[PDB]
Design a protein around this ligand. Sequence first.
Ligand SMILES: C[C@@H]1O[C@@H](O[C@@H]2[C@@H](O[C@H]3O[C@H](CO)[C@H](O)[C@H](O)[C@H]3O)[C@@H](O)[C@@H](CO)O[C@@H]2O)[C@@H](O)[C@H](O)[C@@H]1O
Ligand SMILES: C[C@@H]1O[C@@H](O[C@@H]2[C@@H](O[C@H]3O[C@H](CO)[C@H](O)[C@H](O)[C@H]3O)[C@@H](O)[C@@H](CO)O[C@@H]2O)[C@@H](O)[C@H](O)[C@@H]1O
Ligand SMILES: C[C@@H]1O[C@@H](O[C@@H]2[C@@H](O[C@H]3O[C@H](CO)[C@H](O)[C@H](O)[C@H]3O)[C@@H](O)[C@@H](CO)O[C@@H]2O)[C@@H](O)[C@H](O)[C@@H]1O
Ligand SMILES: C[C@@H]1O[C@@H](O[C@@H]2[C@@H](O[C@H]3O[C@H](CO)[C@H](O)[C@H](O)[C@H]3O)[C@@H](O)[C@@H](CO)O[C@@H]2O)[C@@H](O)[C@H](O)[C@@H]1O
Ligand SMILES: C[C@@H]1O[C@@H](O[C@@H]2[C@@H](O[C@H]3O[C@H](CO)[C@H](O)[C@H](O)[C@H]3O)[C@@H](O)[C@@H](CO)O[C@H]2O)[C@@H](O)[C@H](O)[C@@H]1O
Ligand SMILES: C[C@@H]1O[C@@H](O[C@@H]2[C@@H](O[C@H]3O[C@H](CO)[C@H](O)[C@H](O)[C@H]3O)[C@@H](O)[C@@H](CO)O[C@H]2O)[C@@H](O)[C@H](O)[C@@H]1O
Ligand SMILES: *[C@@H](C(=O)O)[C@H](O)C(=O)N[C@@H](CC(C)C)C(=O)NCCCCNC(N)=[NH2+]
Ligand SMILES: *[C@@H](C(=O)O)[C@H](O)C(=O)N[C@@H](CC(C)C)C(=O)NCCCCNC(N)=[NH2+]
Ligand SMILES: [Ca+2]
Ligand SMILES: [Ca+2]
Ligand SMILES: [Ca+2]
Ligand SMILES: [Ca+2]
Ligand SMILES: [Ca+2]
Ligand SMILES: [Ca+2]
Ligand code: NA
Ligand code: NA
Lengths: 292, 292
Amino acid sequence: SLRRGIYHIENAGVPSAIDLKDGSSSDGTPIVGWQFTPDTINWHQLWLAEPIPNVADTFTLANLFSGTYMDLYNGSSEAGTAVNGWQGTAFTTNPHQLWTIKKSSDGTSYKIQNYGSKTFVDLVNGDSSDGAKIAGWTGTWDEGNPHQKWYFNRMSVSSAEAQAAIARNPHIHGTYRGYILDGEYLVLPNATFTQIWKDSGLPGSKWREQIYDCDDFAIAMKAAVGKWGADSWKANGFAIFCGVMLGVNKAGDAAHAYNFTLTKDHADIVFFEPQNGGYLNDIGYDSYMAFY
Amino acid sequence: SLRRGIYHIENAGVPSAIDLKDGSSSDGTPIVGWQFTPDTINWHQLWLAEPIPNVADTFTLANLFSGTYMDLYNGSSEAGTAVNGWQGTAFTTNPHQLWTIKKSSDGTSYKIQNYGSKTFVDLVNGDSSDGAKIAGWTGTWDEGNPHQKWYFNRMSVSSAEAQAAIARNPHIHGTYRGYILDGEYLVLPNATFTQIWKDSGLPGSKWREQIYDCDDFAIAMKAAVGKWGADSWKANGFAIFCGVMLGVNKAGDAAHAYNFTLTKDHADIVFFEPQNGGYLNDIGYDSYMAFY
Ligand SMILES: C[C@@H]1O[C@@H](O[C@@H]2[C@@H](O[C@H]3O[C@H](CO)[C@H](O)[C@H](O)[C@H]3O)[C@@H](O)[C@@H](CO)O[C@@H]2O)[C@@H](O)[C@H](O)[C@@H]1O
Ligand SMILES: C[C@@H]1O[C@@H](O[C@@H]2[C@@H](O[C@H]3O[C@H](CO)[C@H](O)[C@H](O)[C@H]3O)[C@@H](O)[C@@H](CO)O[C@@H]2O)[C@@H](O)[C@H](O)[C@@H]1O
Ligand SMILES: C[C@@H]1O[C@@H](O[C@@H]2[C@@H](O[C@H]3O[C@H](CO)[C@H](O)[C@H](O)[C@H]3O)[C@@H](O)[C@@H](CO)O[C@@H]2O)[C@@H](O)[C@H](O)[C@@H]1O
Ligand SMILES: C[C@@H]1O[C@@H](O[C@@H]2[C@@H](O[C@H]3O[C@H](CO)[C@H](O)[C@H](O)[C@H]3O)[C@@H](O)[C@@H](CO)O[C@@H]2O)[C@@H](O)[C@H](O)[C@@H]1O
Ligand SMILES: C[C@@H]1O[C@@H](O[C@@H]2[C@@H](O[C@H]3O[C@H](CO)[C@H](O)[C@H](O)[C@H]3O)[C@@H](O)[C@@H](CO)O[C@H]2O)[C@@H](O)[C@H](O)[C@@H]1O
Ligand SMILES: C[C@@H]1O[C@@H](O[C@@H]2[C@@H](O[C@H]3O[C@H](CO)[C@H](O)[C@H](O)[C@H]3O)[C@@H](O)[C@@H](CO)O[C@H]2O)[C@@H](O)[C@H](O)[C@@H]1O
Ligand SMILES: *[C@@H](C(=O)O)[C@H](O)C(=O)N[C@@H](CC(C)C)C(=O)NCCCCNC(N)=[NH2+]
Ligand SMILES: *[C@@H](C(=O)O)[C@H](O)C(=O)N[C@@H](CC(C)C)C(=O)NCCCCNC(N)=[NH2+]
Ligand SMILES: [Ca+2]
Ligand SMILES: [Ca+2]
Ligand SMILES: [Ca+2]
Ligand SMILES: [Ca+2]
Ligand SMILES: [Ca+2]
Ligand SMILES: [Ca+2]
Ligand code: NA
Ligand code: NA
């Protein structure tokens, strides 16, 4: 079954993502196909899938930027029915906003079925142009039609997935303890992680003994990413990934505070030095504590 | 022996503190007696005592605001010699800036002797008016003269002292682990702690599930206090006290993130709720983790 999380949803036949037009929170804003740039935040194209309790394989889909919900207009089962953003809530009983999402007959892409209409999210005519209509349409679970197939490319990790990534790192001290703060995390491309660092004022901050030293840079980076998350997204129910670590060197005679992020594949961590913006597979310290 | 730390230094005969006039970093700025307000940050009246290695009871005294050093002008042993702020470093060999500080014959106040001249810091004539001259003067270690006696009222804690304060709290979980970031900490009056919170923007921040929830408020408060410390003080070698805690309720079914500070007596901690500015002796959670 599809996991709770944040997805970039890409048509299987042409490289168009599901896009809430202009990111607008107005009710009735069209959801359209649109091109995308890999390894970026695609600002209007991220969707938080919230599973519904006791309704197998069925979800709301909140646009991360607008906080509004994928909605089949008036629930109609007519082919060509509008799919728009619309105000709602994560666990609504409104069928217009409830979507049964299960694997297609290719085993990798998914179909997206409205729970009330039983019709499917369809890139009309397989049109690849920017702004192409997405509609509800008649269909079947098993058929090959690529207009109705969608790759759910996962952009978040659970806390357990983050924990796993840490656990297979080679630079973890024997005394390590991790402290988990949230449940579901948007993983940032390094280009975005870097941007937040640049915009934080940290690049200009001078190292000063105790009063503005490693711990202060690492905590300030984590607070900057937290502030960015809230200021940037209107949906709730997830956090932004940015860890702090405390580590000790191999000799046991120096310790350091720094940050960490995750690889593009979500399988491994990467250290970040908030005093200079560098990313390192080996920062020269084994982590004895992390919070994230 | 006097401990490394930050002191407000108050004459024993009249309630005048040792004040670097206007907080000025100019070389030759006079150090004067001046009235003070208890339970405030007295901005021009805080002094960081750095012990010198292998020189018993002898220190530099850096003004916390200016980062300049108490200096006996040209080292003269003449009575009436100026005592001024002057550029220097924490472990200088310049005797003009080195001060042997030991208890007076009352056992509670201290005398402050220049290491090169062997003369003593003296509030001339015991003058209580704002701006009264402080000079080097002839004297003895044992005599009663209040012009040369000074109470060193300690405004910082060591990390070990902070640890002790935590350890005697009644609201510490059996699994608690603390992570110590710095060595010496300025303890803020709650009036100042509050000010930093108000100025941080946190009072206006809305609680939002995961994206701006308890952990984000607590971390943002700690980062605000860190930023305030660096922006406010020019001396190095100390930090500002502001902890983060993670805690669990008595039933074991709810957890929360918050901050903590220390009492005026430095003996106990006080919890702070960064979502509303409240101070509480009991926040309803036992801490299982802290960093500070
Ligand atoms: C059958 C109809 O269902 C609800 O109205 C839906 C709309 O529902 C959503 O928006 C309205 C405001 O327009 C409201 O906030 C509601 O809680 C939310 O779920 C929406 O799905 C539109 C477009 O497809 O269709 C309906 O107008 C409900 O509010 C109505 O009273 C009525 O029961
Ligand atoms: C090229 C074309 O592709 C398929 O038709 C799709 C449509 O497919 C869906 O709707 C049709 C009815 O119009 C039918 O219910 C089918 O099972 C269902 O998948 C639909 O995707 C539209 C809009 O994008 O485009 C095409 O018309 C195929 O069934 C046609 O025979 C034909 O090969
Ligand atoms: C004997 C004299 O000692 C030093 O000069 C001191 C001053 O020392 C402090 O300030 C100077 C700059 O004015 C410099 O930065 C130095 O490192 C610092 O310790 C100061 O104590 C004044 C006032 O009492 O007296 C002397 O001018 C040294 O720089 C001189 O070359 C010379 O050795
Ligand atoms: C009222 C006055 O108090 C004392 O004299 C202080 C001075 O005391 C210090 O300097 C004198 C020499 O002038 C002497 O060396 C003494 O041992 C030493 O403490 C000094 O504090 C000045 C400036 O503030 O004020 C007074 O003159 C006392 O010795 C006097 O006899 C007299 O009672
Ligand atoms: C916020 C905004 O994002 C970008 O424009 C979006 C646009 O973004 C997608 O399409 C562009 C090309 O038009 C690129 O492929 C991006 O990588 C995609 O993410 C769409 O989402 C449309 C329709 O909703 O809205 C635009 O605002 C970017 O071009 C803007 O400069 C800006 O950063
Ligand atoms: C930064 C500045 O601090 C205060 O003025 C200082 C002054 O502060 C002391 O004396 C005042 C009365 O003049 C109060 O008792 C304070 O509680 C003391 O800390 C002195 O340090 C003088 C001489 O260096 O400089 C002034 O700037 C305050 O009155 C100002 O408004 C301001 O906040
Ligand atoms: C880091 C820097 O600015 O380079 C700065 O030296 C610092 O604070 N170092 C601390 C450790 C960090 C907070 C992790 C430090 O060296 N502390 C002394 C020992 C305590 C940490 N080590 C262990 N294992 N407890
Ligand atoms: C706190 C709030 O905004 O009220 C928010 O619920 C939160 O993040 N709670 C977390 C705990 C904090 C990070 C301390 C939470 O409840 N986590 C679930 C359990 C993990 C924490 N408990 C223990 N002991 N590990
Ligand atoms: Ca057909
Ligand atoms: Ca949380
Ligand atoms: Ca620090
Ligand atoms: Ca005398
Ligand atoms: Ca430190
Ligand atoms: Ca959070
Ligand atoms: Na730097
Ligand atoms: Na509030």
